[PDB]
Amino acid sequence: MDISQLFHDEVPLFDNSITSKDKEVIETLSEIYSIVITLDHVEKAYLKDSIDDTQYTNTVDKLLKQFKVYLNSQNKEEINKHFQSIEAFADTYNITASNAITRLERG
């Protein structure tokens, strides 16, 4: 088949049969991701000595606490279900956040 047939009609963001709980899980993952990405840039900017030492500590403390709140919800099993598939996408397209991941490991 050609592309015109393969990509004929619009595909919805979520399957029309997605449960309320499943959708909630994905939305929680979007928030977790935003913290990971945002934190990665903050960590990097701190390495360049462009951020105030107090402001950095407070901001990263807040981001770490928020990350913990999100993770400790959504059955807790259902979030790990997706983590591996997020890694597969990230590896395919070289999406990295290694400074954030290192910080989240410790705190």
Partner 1 sequence: MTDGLNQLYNLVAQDYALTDTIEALSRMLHRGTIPLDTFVKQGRELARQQFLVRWHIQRITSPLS
Ligand X SMILES: CCCCCCCCCC[N+](C)(C)[O-]
By the 10 Å C-beta count (0-12 exposed, 13-18 middle, 19+ buried), 26 is classed as middle
Looking at beta carbons only, is 2 or 77 nearer to partner 1? 2
Least CB distance to ligand X at residue 58 (A): 17
CB count, 10 Å around CB of 52?
Answer: 11
Choose the stretch contacting ligand X; rule: CB under 6 A; options: 3-11, 45-53, 57-65, 92-100. 92-100
Least CB distance to ligand X at residue 86 (A): 4
CB count, 10 Å around CB of 36?
Answer: 17
Least CB distance to ligand X at residue 88 (A): 8
Report if residue 45 touches partner 1, rule: CB under 8 A.
Answer: yes
Report if residue 101 touches ligand X, rule: CB under 6 A.
Answer: no
Residues 6 or more apart whose CB falls under 8 angstroms from that of 70 comprise: 28, 31, 32, 35
The residues binding ligand X (CB under 6 A) are 85-86, 89-90, 93-95
